[PDB]
């Protein structure tokens, strides 16, 4: 895209690439950030780059942002229990905020890998269906089997009307 001042962040590639996934407890996330100060600087970047990464990967988590309410910048987190997490981001680097969040409510790499494997096991090689869900379809295809008459017309013997006209006579 052309318009926008960091257009690379309106990509799909930039969206998939951001990594934080949230635990199942997180529901709401509240970013309170500040416009004017040097000590705000990191937080801002986080909103401007990382917030749109985060959200994409967690489409069900409300992410809200307030400006200039509180004189010092922070994150809040509202979990399922009624647990309220409070993450102070001040002189932090943008990267530091990201990784800190990942630490606190993340998902272990193993967790993700497990889950994706548990979904990948759902589509089984051996079934037969429409090209959408399966690979192979009619078993026209597989080598040793019979060729399906569209491609390779069948023996006079195996036709219905051959059997019919033979059983009649």
């Amino acid at each position: 895209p052309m318009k926008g001042r960091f257009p690379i962040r309106r990509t799909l590639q930039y969206l998939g690439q951001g990594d934080v996934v949230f635990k199942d407890s997180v529901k709401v996330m509240t970013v309170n950030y500040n416009t004017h100060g040097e000590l705000g600087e990191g937080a801002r970047k986080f909103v401007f780059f990382n917030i749109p990464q985060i959200q994409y990967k967690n489409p069900w988590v409300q992410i809200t942002m307030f400006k200039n309410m509180t004189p010092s910048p922070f994150l809040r987190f509202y979990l399922d229990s009624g647990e309220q997490v409070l993450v102070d981001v001040e002189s932090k680097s943008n990267k530091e905020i990201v990784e800190h969040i990942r630490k606190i409510l993340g998902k272990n790499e193993e967790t993700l890998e497990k889950e994706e494997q548990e979904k990948k096991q759902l589509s089984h090689p051996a079934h037969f269906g429409p090209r959408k869900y399966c690979l192979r379809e009619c078993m026209c295809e597989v080598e040793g089997q019979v060729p399906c008459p569209g491609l390779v017309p069948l023996p006079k013997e195996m036709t219905g009307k051959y059997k019919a006209a033979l059983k009649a006579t």
Binding site: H124, P125, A126, L135, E143, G144
Partner: protein
């Protein structure tokens, strides 16, 4: 004793024997190309990148498992002669369950003979290949493994390709696997082409089949002609590990051993053509006194 391919000695010696050629390891492939990616690097970054390369190349280089042959499995699970009179052609019952190791799958048959027989090995495999299609495998055996096509592919010096074909198509413990791998070794031996499979992951199979065929000839000759002493060294070392008790082994070992003494004593005690070894083992030696 217990020597085998997967022993650490045999492994580290066969990795060192094989060699890292990053040009033959990573070589242009015929796949649809993409535009090349560019980045500017430091000396440091290029070194780290180089090591990264070498690390990844090792994984490419990992040896295909060698194994002994499987015996035919014939067992009948049941017989009812009453069914026999149905005179229907063979029924093949496969289990497809995603959790199972493919040697732990159950593959069964009912013939017109009214008996419940387990699947044969070839049968069993082509079944799993049907319901668990895996790439490169034909479900009916590919023509190219006839002797004519074999010789044709050897002429073209494609031997890496054939050995890459069997890895995918057949199973490492099969009959055909062994027939083709071994026959192919015979070809590189009679043609003296050994340096082909050098940086290949196939090298381990070269070394083994020969140590166990006890013809080390061409590989030693070649190694000394290629100006590689250390490889001939670890190779005789290997013939000593896979032949611990023999005249050559215990004598040329316990007397004394190093490059000159062990390579020349195993050049005298392996007589296939000891005249070849002794010739070349002179030449390299001479080519040292001129270079130093």
């Amino acid at each position: 004793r217990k020597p085998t391919f997967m022993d650490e000695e045999v492994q580290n010696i066969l990795i060192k024997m094989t060699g890292l050629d990053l040009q033959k390891i990573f070589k242009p492939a015929l796949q649809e190309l993409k535009p090349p990616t560019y980045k500017l690097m430091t000396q440091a970054q290029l070194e780290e990148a180089t090591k990264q390369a070498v690390e990844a190349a090792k994984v490419r280089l990992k040896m295909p498992p060698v194994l002994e042959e499987r015996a035919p499995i014939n067992d009948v699970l049941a017989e009812d002669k009453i069914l026999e009179g149905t005179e229907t052609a063979k029924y093949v019952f496969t289990d497809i369950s995603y959790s199972i190791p493919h040697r732990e799958r159950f593959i069964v048959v009912r013939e017109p003979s009214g008996t419940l027989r387990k699947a044969s090995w070839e049968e069993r495999d082509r079944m799993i290949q049907v319901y668990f299609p895996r790439e490169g495998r034909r479900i009916l055996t590919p023509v190219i493994f006839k002797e004519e096509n074999l010789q044709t592919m050897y002429s073209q010096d494609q031997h890496v390709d054939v050995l890459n074909l069997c890895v995918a198509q057949f199973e490492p413990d099969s009959a055909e696997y062994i027939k083709i791998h071994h026959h192919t070794y015979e070809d590189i031996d009679k043609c003296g082409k050994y340096d082909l499979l050098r940086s290949t992951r196939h090298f381990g199979g070269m070394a083994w089949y020969f140590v166990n065929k006890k013809k080390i000839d061409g590989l030693l000759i070649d190694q000394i002609q290629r100006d590689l002493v250390s490889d001939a060294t670890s190779l005789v070392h290997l013939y000593h590990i896979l032949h611990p008790x023999x005249x050559x082994x215990x004598x040329x070992x316990x007397x004394x051993x190093x490059x000159x003494x062990x390579x020349x004593x195993x050049x005298x005690x392996x007589x296939x053509x000891x005249x070849x070894x002794x010739x070349x083992x002179x030449x390299x030696x001479x080519x040292x006194x001129x270079x130093x």
